[PDB]
Amino acid sequence: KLDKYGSQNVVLFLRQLMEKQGFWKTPENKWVTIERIHIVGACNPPTDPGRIPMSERFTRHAAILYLGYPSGKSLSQIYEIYYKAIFKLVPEFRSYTEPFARASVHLYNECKARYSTGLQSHYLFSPRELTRLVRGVYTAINTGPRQTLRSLIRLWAYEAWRIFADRLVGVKEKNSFEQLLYETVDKYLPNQDLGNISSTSLLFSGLLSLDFKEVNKTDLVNFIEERFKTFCDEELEVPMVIHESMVDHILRIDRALKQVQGHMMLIGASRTGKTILTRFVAWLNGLKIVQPKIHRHSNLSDFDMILKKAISDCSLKESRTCLIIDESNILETAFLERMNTLLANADIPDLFQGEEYDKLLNNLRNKTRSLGLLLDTEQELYDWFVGEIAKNLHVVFTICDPTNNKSSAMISSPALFNRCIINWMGDWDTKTMSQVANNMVDVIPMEFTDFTIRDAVVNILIHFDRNFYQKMKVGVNPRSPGYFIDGLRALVKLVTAKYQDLQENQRFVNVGLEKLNESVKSLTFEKERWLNTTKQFSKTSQELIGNCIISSIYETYFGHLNERERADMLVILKRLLGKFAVKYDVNYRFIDYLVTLDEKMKWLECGLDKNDYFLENMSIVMNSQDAVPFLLDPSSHMITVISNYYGNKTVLLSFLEEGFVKRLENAIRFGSVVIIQDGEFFDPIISRLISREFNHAGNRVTVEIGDHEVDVSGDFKLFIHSCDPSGDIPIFLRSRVRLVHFVTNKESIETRIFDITLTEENAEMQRKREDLIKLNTEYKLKLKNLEKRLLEELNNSQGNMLENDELMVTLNNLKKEAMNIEKKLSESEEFFPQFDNLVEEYSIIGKHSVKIFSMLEKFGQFHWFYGISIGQFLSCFKRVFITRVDEILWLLYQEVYCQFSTALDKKFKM
Amino acid sequence: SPILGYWKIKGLVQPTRLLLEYLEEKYEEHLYERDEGDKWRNKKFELGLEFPNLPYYIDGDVKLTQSMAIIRYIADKHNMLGGCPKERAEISMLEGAVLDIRYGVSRIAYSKDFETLKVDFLSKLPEMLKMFEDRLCHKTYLNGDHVTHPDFMLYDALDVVLYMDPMCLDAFPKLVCFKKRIEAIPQIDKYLKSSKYIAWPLQGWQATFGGGDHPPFVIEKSLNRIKKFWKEAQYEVIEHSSGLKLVREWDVLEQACKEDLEELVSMKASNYYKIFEQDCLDLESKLTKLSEIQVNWVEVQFYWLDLYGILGEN
């Protein structure tokens, strides 16, 4: 690149060498005249992306030769001689070299044409691929069992897949290649001995046999299963479900990690497991896993250190390392530049220069002789050093969103793109979703149903996740399954928590059935007639599976959605629950279902806002913590709420303070509840603390932070807090984080205008709305409170006199209470559909008012003095009271014009 | 099914228990719990062992006491003691070095000076572990490709020394391996996870080390590193043009003190610090006094040196 003025000095330096013939010495300050050195340069058309225009002042000294691609007929001729050489291994198919060479070129010609830089950037094909396929074929032959023609073509098909189609995104193109491969075999190698040529069906491996052979699908999966437990036990502890995609992907990385120079860059979205499979396949190949320990406050020197070691270990210690570089690791431009030098050249020159070159040069001679070969010259030794790196270091890149401009630069970088094997894991397929879901609901709380039952639940969640991304998210399929996994983990944790509580209360009414029968007298036979409740339980249990579906979805998918965006997804979920034979509570409320009246009091005591939205939010934060919650609120009124809840134990930090790095190690050791004040900024180190990763010890539980392994308490809690929604958190965090929005939106106006409208429209029913759900929960808590009071005295007074009678006149008062509930449930089914009839008129009022607030909000954007709060709009809408809907609407437009016209200038009035 | 009498603890029977589980052999126990010291005295003399003691084992008219005589028996009943002088002596040397760890525990476990006697044990431990790391260079287990009964002895030891030090293996990765390897052996792994496994204590409930129900903490290990650091405190000292000597590079100690003071205040959040806590309060009063005089001394040092430019020379 070129100075911001736009002048590339590197090129002018060469120009200096071409024209002048010597150059000026940069530190030492003299002229040195270069003798007998020539300058030759290669480059792409400068119409190409990445490419910079060169100065006519430099190119004026050069002879330019444009070399293009050859023939499509010379390519066919050239690779025949390539096949000729490799078929000296399988001489019985010497007549098959020409149709193989003609096919390889055809497959190339077509891939280049069908998958172009019009569809994706990385769709860039060349004769390099042909030669990559040719060698890929030989290596499989040179290390495979004697080959039938059916073997060789499938052998060729597998390499064709790995070279041309692993890079392909999505499925339309990937299917296209399957048929292209079929189309090409049919034209050049006509056999009915072929099978299913799709990558799922042809699996080639040297994991099972000594020879590289196509292996059986069942033989492989079982081989992985025995090895994964081992890798799980031996290395870091994380259990997973091995599925159809994963076996195909494990083989991909296996061939990569085997080849002399092995570079694969993996494009895996997030949570796909791109990083974990890499760790595994590396361990199966016996490659040391090196993972740069970077953070916000890492210098290039740090990364230099990390690289230098892994390079020195690869030649001078013969280590055989696998370097896993994530997109997060490349912090600055130079970091990537370093990575380039490591791939296009097989050394980083700058690390070892001058005296550090002499130290390296010395150490090199020691090990070379030790192994038994002396190398005379300076050049002879370096070429061993580099050649050793080239076979012992393996860099796997894991990039999640190639849409990101930092991750774009990885794929863009020529060094990286040419010497890497590009592989695509960008989405979870519906079959792999179902496979994973199945194994997660393998535990069986459930009971037979209408229609399979577990088969139905999984099909809903796939149809929900597919509807969630379809409706909510914008930007085209860069991001994929994460919530889905957490959604399933929530359901399992929720059904077990609910079914243990359902069977607990069913056990409390069964123990009360034994106690009333023992006694039998005048009122007690009504109590016995409490089969209404006993009959009721079965219908209550029927719905708990589908009720947990909604509750888990709320905890996972809803946290960061709008007032209306929550309700609307719920619709799509409920109608999905409606098609499937799962039974749910039609009068359902997320707050009442998962929040307890004791906790609901506790939260407000701190000073949580009364809003339903803010209740649901707080519920999502607390109730589930299998993962770290990310709280977003402009006014840090939330950061105080959590402070009043955890008290003394509340220790507040922010990613920005100096002492953060250490103060967290002290917070983790002694069970301190921690909130991090600036979520937007986030260093890599917390990262193992965000993913639930630990190393279990004799008594102690250790977590690795940057370097030192520190003890976790378990009474320790973690919260991350942010103030601006504009601030974007890294894809790593966002996926393992439970995102909850405490935001005072324009959507919040629609919700809150109806409450104020109904109090001045039908005061009787908005007043009875509060006590409807209040006395619903209160009387049911008093029903459970008086059942406990009755059982305590029945066990105390059984040998004593009829004291129980003095509680039975209170149980005579309960005949109002038990039946008060029944009185209110009857009028509820009458009240709710009337409530929902009244939502629509106010919606017509509601829709107008947001668009008005949006307009008054937009004035504050143009100018500073033109501010408006939501409260100013509310106060104004109250003034509207102190065809009815039509006149109230026109009362709003009038009152808004009356009050807010004052605070604008004559231009903005109009 | 052979019959073993011992404490309901790992104690002197653990390795044997593993060997048995290795040969998948089922067996029966006379377990003396922590508070069943009677049941033992009830059978102590009325059992017909040639050397009444714990543990005592009895099968096919093999009446045994002495953990060694027992283990060796099971070993010999499977032809595992060695095939020649050399391999036999090698297997005995394993036996020896394993006991030099299991017994080494009990000798500094009765000591009232435990948290400071372990210091002398852990200093010797390295030299012992090292030898094993070497032996395991170009080997899978000491004495060959197959783990044997002495590996079940070292495993009991390991299990116990991890409680005394969580970082005992960090210095010996070849053993950390050997340890996972053992845990991997089908029979063993199946056992550890079995219901018949009574996991703890390591020693007799009465012992200082590895006694009682279970491990609680970090507070000792941290405070040891704090006190260690403050008994090596050094100030670059530099005498200037005239008389007085000046203290260069304030910040380092200045920083450490504030940090180490904050560490002790975060110790108050912990549940387990209350009794151990009083000592920390004494270290708190010591450093809060050191920062009191740290603040003023840098002020003086600075204000004097400035004023020396002004009046000290002319």
Curated annotation (Swiss-Prot), chain A:
ATP binds at residues 268-275. Residues 230-476 are annotated as: AAA 4. Residues 594-823 are annotated as: AAA 5. It is found in: Cytoplasm, Cytoskeleton. Residues 756-832 form a coiled coil. It comes from the Eukaryota. Disulfide bonds: none annotated. Dynein heavy chains probably consist of an N-terminal stem (which binds cargo and interacts with other dynein components), and the head or motor domain. The motor contains six tandemly-linked AAA domains in the head, which form a ring. A stalk-like structure (formed by two of the coiled coil domains) protrudes between AAA 4 and AAA 5 and terminates in a microtubule-binding site. A seventh domain may also contribute to this ring; it is not clear whether the N-terminus or the C-terminus forms this extra domain. The dynein complex consists of at least two heavy chains and a number of intermediate and light chains. Interacts with DYN3. Belongs to the dynein heavy chain family. Present with 195 molecules/cell in log phase SD medium. Cytoplasmic dynein acts as a motor for the intracellular retrograde motility of vesicles and organelles along microtubules. Dynein has ATPase activity; the force-producing power stroke is thought to occur on release of ADP. Required to maintain uniform nuclear distribution in hyphae. May play an important role in the proper orientation of the mitotic spindle into the budding daughter cell yeast. Probably required for normal progression of the cell cycle. This is Dynein heavy chain, cytoplasmic. The chain holds residues 2493 to 3696 of 4092 of the full protein.
From Swiss-Prot, chain B:
It comes from the Eukaryota. One of its GO terms (biological process) is glutathione metabolic process. Residues 84-202 form the GST C-terminal domain. Its EC number is 2.5.1.18. Substrate binds at residue 110. Belongs to the GST superfamily. Mu family. There are at least two isoenzymes of GST in S.japonicum. This is Glutathione S-transferase class-mu 26 kDa isozyme. It comes from Schistosoma japonicum (Blood fluke). The lineage of its organism: Eukaryota, Metazoa, Spiralia, Lophotrochozoa, Platyhelminthes.
